[PDB]
Amino acid sequence: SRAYDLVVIGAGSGGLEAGWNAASLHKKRVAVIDLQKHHGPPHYAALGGTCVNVGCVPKKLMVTGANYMDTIRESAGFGWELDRESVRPNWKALIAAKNKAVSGINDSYEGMFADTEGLTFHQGFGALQDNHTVLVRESADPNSAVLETLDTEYILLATGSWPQHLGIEGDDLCITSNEAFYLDEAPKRALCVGGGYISIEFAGIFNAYKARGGQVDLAYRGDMILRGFDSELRKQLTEQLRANGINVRTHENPAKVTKNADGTRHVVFESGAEADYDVVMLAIGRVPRSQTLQLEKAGVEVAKNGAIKVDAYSKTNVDNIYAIGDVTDRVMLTPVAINEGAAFVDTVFANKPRATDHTKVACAVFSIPPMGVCGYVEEDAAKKYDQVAVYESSFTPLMHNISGSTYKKFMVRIVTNHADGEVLGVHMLGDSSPEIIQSVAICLKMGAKISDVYNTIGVHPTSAEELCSMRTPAYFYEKGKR
Amino acid sequence: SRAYDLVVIGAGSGGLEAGWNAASLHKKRVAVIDLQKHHGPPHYAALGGTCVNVGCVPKKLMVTGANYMDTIRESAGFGWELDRESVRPNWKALIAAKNKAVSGINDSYEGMFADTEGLTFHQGFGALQDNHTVLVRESADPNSAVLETLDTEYILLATGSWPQHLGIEGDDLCITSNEAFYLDEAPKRALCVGGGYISIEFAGIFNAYKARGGQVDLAYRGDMILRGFDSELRKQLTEQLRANGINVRTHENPAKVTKNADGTRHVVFESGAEADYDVVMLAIGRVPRSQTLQLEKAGVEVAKNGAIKVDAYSKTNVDNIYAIGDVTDRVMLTPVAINEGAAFVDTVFANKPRATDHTKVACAVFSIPPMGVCGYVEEDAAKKYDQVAVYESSFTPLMHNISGSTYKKFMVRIVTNHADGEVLGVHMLGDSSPEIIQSVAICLKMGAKISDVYNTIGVHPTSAEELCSMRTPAYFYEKGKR
Numbered sequence: 001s002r003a004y005d006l007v008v009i010g011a012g013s014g015g016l017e018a019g020w021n022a023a024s025l026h027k028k029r030v031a032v033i034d035l036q037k038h039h040g041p042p043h044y045a046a047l048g049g050t051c052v053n054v055g056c057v058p059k060k061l062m063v064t065g066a067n068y069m070d071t072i073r074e075s076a077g078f079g080w081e082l083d084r085e086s087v088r089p090n091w092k093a094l095i096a097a098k099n100k101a102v103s104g105i106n107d108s109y110e111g112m113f114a115d116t117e118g119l120t121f122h123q124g125f126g127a128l129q130d131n132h133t134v135l136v137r138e139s140a141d142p143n144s145a146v147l148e149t150l151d152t153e154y155i156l157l158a159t160g161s162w163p164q165h166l167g168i169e170g171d172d173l174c175i176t177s178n179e180a181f182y183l184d185e186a187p188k189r190a191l192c193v194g195g196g197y198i199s200i201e202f203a204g205i206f207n208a209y210k211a212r213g214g215q216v217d218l219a220y221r222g223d224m225i226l227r228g229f230d231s232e233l234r235k236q237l238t239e240q241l242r243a244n245g246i247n248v249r250t251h252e253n254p255a256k257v258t259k260n261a262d263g264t265r266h267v268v269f270e271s272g273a274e275a276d277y278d279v280v281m282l283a284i285g286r287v288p289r290s291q292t293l294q295l296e297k298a299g300v301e302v303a304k305n306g307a308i309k310v311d312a313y314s315k316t317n318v319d320n321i322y323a324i325g326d327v328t329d330r331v332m333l334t335p336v337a338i339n340e341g342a343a344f345v346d347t348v349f350a351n352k353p354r355a356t357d358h359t360k361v362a363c364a365v366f367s368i369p370p371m372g373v374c375g376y377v378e379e380d381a382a383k384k385y386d387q388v389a390v391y392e393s394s395f396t397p398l399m400h401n402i403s404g405s406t407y408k409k410f411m412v413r414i415v416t417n418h419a420d421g422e423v424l425g426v427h428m429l430g431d432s433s434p435e436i437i438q439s440v441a442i443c444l445k446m447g448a449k450i451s452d453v454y455n456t457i458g459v460h461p462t463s464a465e466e467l468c469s470m471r472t473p474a475y476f477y478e479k480g481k482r
Numbered sequence: 483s484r485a486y487d488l489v490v491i492g493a494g495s496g497g498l499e500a501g502w503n504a505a506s507l508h509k510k511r512v513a514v515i516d517l518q519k520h521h522g523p524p525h526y527a528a529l530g531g532t533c534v535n536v537g538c539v540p541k542k543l544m545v546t547g548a549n550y551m552d553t554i555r556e557s558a559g560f561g562w563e564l565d566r567e568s569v570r571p572n573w574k575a576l577i578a579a580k581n582k583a584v585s586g587i588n589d590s591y592e593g594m595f596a597d598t599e600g601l602t603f604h605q606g607f608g609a610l611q612d613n614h615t616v617l618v619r620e621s622a623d624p625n626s627a628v629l630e631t632l633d634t635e636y637i638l639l640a641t642g643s644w645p646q647h648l649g650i651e652g653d654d655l656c657i658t659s660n661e662a663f664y665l666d667e668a669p670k671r672a673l674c675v676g677g678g679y680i681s682i683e684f685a686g687i688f689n690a691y692k693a694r695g696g697q698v699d700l701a702y703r704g705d706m707i708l709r710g711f712d713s714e715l716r717k718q719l720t721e722q723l724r725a726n727g728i729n730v731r732t733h734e735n736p737a738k739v740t741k742n743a744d745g746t747r748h749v750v751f752e753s754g755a756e757a758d759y760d761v762v763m764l765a766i767g768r769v770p771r772s773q774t775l776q777l778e779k780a781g782v783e784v785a786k787n788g789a790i791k792v793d794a795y796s797k798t799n800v801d802n803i804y805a806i807g808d809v810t811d812r813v814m815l816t817p818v819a820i821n822e823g824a825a826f827v828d829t830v831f832a833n834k835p836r837a838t839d840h841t842k843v844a845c846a847v848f849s850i851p852p853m854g855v856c857g858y859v860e861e862d863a864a865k866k867y868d869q870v871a872v873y874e875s876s877f878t879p880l881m882h883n884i885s886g887s888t889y890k891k892f893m894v895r896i897v898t899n900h901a902d903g904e905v906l907g908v909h910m911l912g913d914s915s916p917e918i919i920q921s922v923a924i925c926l927k928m929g930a931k932i933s934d935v936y937n938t939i940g941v942h943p944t945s946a947e948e949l950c951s952m953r954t955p956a957y958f959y960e961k962g963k964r
């Protein structure tokens with residue numbers, strides 16, 4: 001058996017930051033464990049994690065592909081002539097290009113290991129024996145061949161999460177985002193089940209690569225898609241997805257999925273509504289991946305959902321064992337998991353305890369059109385503050401008066417503490433909003449006030465200068481109002 | 483002589499802001515004078531000024547149209563299959579749509595004047611007889627028919643700038659950006675003379691709408707284009723212009739232009755090289771437009787190049803005559819002129835002195851690819867502070883590896899005062915950098931430091947995210963580079 005300072009189980013966004021930082025900057029002997037080295041089936045994620053293999057990186061490439069549907073249509077207004085009846089998308093080419101890109105990054109991570117002192121990769125399933133030794137086995141099965149036993153001082157769990165499935169009749173006929181990245185054919189008709197951002201992102205990808213006459217339906221249990229986002233922005237996004245032809249079936253949930261003779265799936269909705277689809281993708285949530293780790297043999301314990309309970313510095317109850325990223329169920333985004341992996345190495349190896357601030361974290365939804373969002377939604381702000389002011393504007397860019405997509409309203413909403421003037425949250429809908437929100441997030445982790453925003457001079461013509469053009473509140477909340 | 487609180491000569495960006503404010507906010511009686519109500523020859527600019535009519539707004543529509551040449555080409559990498567030989571630009575469709583968009587905006591300004599009691603528009607050439615009477619004549623000739631003689635308490639001079647010409651033989655065969663907005667056919671071969679943002683932006687418009695086998699040359703008298711911008715960015719923009727096929731000709735200046743029998747124009751350069759072009763457009767400069775105002779008749783000092791000299795509150799030597807916008811030669815951007823108009827009304831009519839801060843003002847170059855810049859370039863900063871640190875990052879977006887456009891590097895450069903880490907300048911090259919620099923300008927107005935920047939968590943995947951990723955300096959200046 002070998003002796004290590006650290007064993008990282010999971011070589012994703014968090015574990016690879018942590019392991020690399022511990023080995024190079026702190027000259028520690030570190031083992032990182034993951035299931036496989038190259039992206040794809042059987043385990044989908046691999047070296048580099050979910051984001052690089054089956055997450056942020058392939059989905060942004062595929063959403064960029066999807067946007068060309070609207071740009072080739074919108075170019076006509078600006079005088080571009082082409083035979084538009086000949087245009088045909090080519091899913092196969094998109095996936096071949098995407099896989100080339102993702103494998104490039106995988107080969108880069110292998111290089112990274114050859115370049116560094118005490119960092120070794122170990123391929124297999126990590127499971128805990130006791131709080132000081134982790135087993136690398138042949139499969140998730142507890143009775144599989146144990147390949148290696150690693151003796152350690154500190155253990156770091158960073159196994160991520162996995163797609164949540166529906167407990168329904170014919171769940172087995174449904175795919176998740178994982179299989180969606182390797183689909184051989186673009187579906188003609190497809191159902192994305194779920195109201196979250198992964199559902200909405202894929203619905204816009206399938207909508208663009210479908211055969212014309214095809215259809216993509218987005219079915220969600222609640223009233224408006226995208227819980228946790230600004231309610232006005234959720235309302236306008238819905239209509240803009242509908243305007244681009246996807247059918248948002250609100251208050252619909254699968255009940256039965258049955259395979260038809262010709263491979264297609266037949267689905268019975270909870271309303272007794274029925275429809276047939278080439279693909280049914282569940283995008284209903286992500287659960288902490290912790291079940292197989294045998295945490296119990298080391299005394300570390302979980303929450304009901306599988307989340308590993310951790311204090312602010314990422315320490316679990318057994319002290320030499322820490323946990324970061326999606327398995328921790330704090331904020332499930334790559335920059336947060338990376339930040340936590342770095343903070344952990346200052347805390348145990350540099351012995352400077354850094355806790356990661358999961359507050360005012362900005363994020364985006366690469367839907368068509370996209371959203372960039374940071375801080376508080378007004379309902380939450382109005383529960384915590386006395387005087388909340390909501391500022392809002394909407395405009396159709398002059399541009400879309402000429403492209404013909406007049407339904408593309410840019411919307412910006414800013415929530416303030418009206419006593420203070422401190423900007424509590426900024427929520428944007430429209431193109432470039434993911435680019436624009438990163439800088440606004442610096443303004444908010446700095447404590448800007450609405451006077452800071454309208455005293456800056458605008459850069460013209462941009463959509464972003466609206467941020468600097470809003471001075472009168474639309475309405476306020478003194479516990480309530482609207 | 484009649485009875486006015488304010489007469490504003492020049493109904494443009496600054497001029498109209500001040501006139502609306504003085505009237506609807508402070509109930510003053512104000513006359514706004516301009517040459518023309520709608521865009522187009524002979525005066526090109528008209529009600530709404532240069533930006534609305536022959537500036538920011540027409541220009542930006544036209545460069546978004548030009549950008550379709552790249553994205554239609556780039557779609558192929560993402561699997562969008564189409565008849566590549568069918569694709570052709572129609573310049574007539576582009577300027578027809580641009581003219582309706584600008585005609586809409588002109589109509590709404592006439593609307594504005596109907597909806598506000600003390601505001602009136604007077605068409606003609608405004609000139610001063612005395613520091614309390616302004617006469618609007620029929621033409622710019624001092625001896626022309628006086629149409630109106632308005633008598634006024636205050637005068638606001640906001641006549642903007644005009645294109646600068648070359649005094650060479652055949653200058654009258656060249657156009658400026660004014661005429662380029664009404665060209666009937668896109669040039670097959672074109673020459674853009676100048677190195678500032680306006681010839682850069684038109685070179686990209688002409689490059690995209692040219693007939694195949696065409697060519698646009700950019701000729702500049704100096705060593706490198708975009709004097710006054712970050713030197714690494716200028717170098718990199720030149721190389722990206724060349725990769726998209728435009729021919730950048732440094733140390734090059736025309737000597738004489740003659741018209742060919744063909745109708746095209748023959749250009750002899752000062753090096754002795756010759757070539758023929760359909761269009762030769764001069765974008766060598768813009769000079770303050772004070773020349774026919776009769777400023778000596780009111781004793782107001784002009785600064786040689788034409789700039790009306792003013793103090794921080796935009797007051798001239800004559801205490802009831804103020805001047806704003808491009809005529810004062812301070813920052814020739816529409817936002818700055820508007821802000822100066824607002825500040826002016828506060829100071830004289832709301833009796834609260836303001837002054838525009840012309841520092842940290844961000845701006846954008848709508849080149850293909852675009853640039854977004856704010857603050858000091860390192861050279862200037864190095865001659866004011868003892869230790870300046872420069873941070874930079876370059877990367878090709880993943881997407882540009884899939885599309886053909888491998889040359890499209892995104893670059894961000896941050897200049898810091900190394901004493902406390904205060905960010906003095908951020909210079910970016912790449913798509914969306916105009917949209918990103920607007921909110922970075924807010925962080926800069928609030929006194930941001932490099933640590934504010936890397937302590938914000940990123941939004942992944944975005945280009946803007948690179949802002950939060952720069953911890954270590956590339957090099958420093960301790961008076962000189964190190």
Ligand SMILES: Cc1cc2nc3c(=O)[nH]c(=O)nc-3n(C[C@H](O)[C@H](O)[C@H](O)COP(=O)(O)OP(=O)(O)OC[C@H]3O[C@@H](n4cnc5c(N)ncnc54)[C@H](O)[C@@H]3O)c2cc1C
Pocket residue numbers: 009010011012013014015033034035043045046047048049050051054055056057059124125126127158159160161177198289292293324325326327331332333334335337942943
């Ligand atoms: C489709 C999709 C889109 C997303 N898009 C974005 C986006 O645009 N921006 C963003 O910020 N976030 C996005 N996310 C979220 C982001 O991918 C994750 O939050 C982030 O990767 C979490 O990092 P992590 O370190 O917790 O784990 P991960 O990056 O998931 O890595 C965990 C690693 O552990 C390995 N592993 C699992 N169990 C074991 C075991 N027993 N033994 C060994 N190895 C094991 C896995 O194979 C995996 O490689 C997206 C996620 C998905 C699924």
Ligand SMILES: Cc1cc2nc3c(=O)[nH]c(=O)nc-3n(C[C@H](O)[C@H](O)[C@H](O)COP(=O)(O)OP(=O)(O)OC[C@H]3O[C@@H](n4cnc5c(N)ncnc54)[C@H](O)[C@@H]3O)c2cc1C
Pocket residue numbers: 459460461491492493494495496497515516517518525527528529530531532533536537538539541606607608609640641642643659680771774775806807808809813814815816817819
């Ligand atoms: C092609 C081009 C592109 C530009 N793009 C941008 C951009 O993208 N973003 C940006 O911020 N800035 C841009 N600018 C600069 C911007 O157009 C100007 O800075 C801005 O319009 C200046 O405002 P102003 O109030 O000083 O006067 P202007 O807006 O120029 O208006 C001056 C007015 O005075 C009138 N006039 C002049 N003489 C007389 C007279 N004697 N009697 C009566 N009326 C008179 C003119 O018709 C005109 O309407 C661009 C400029 C050009 C030329």
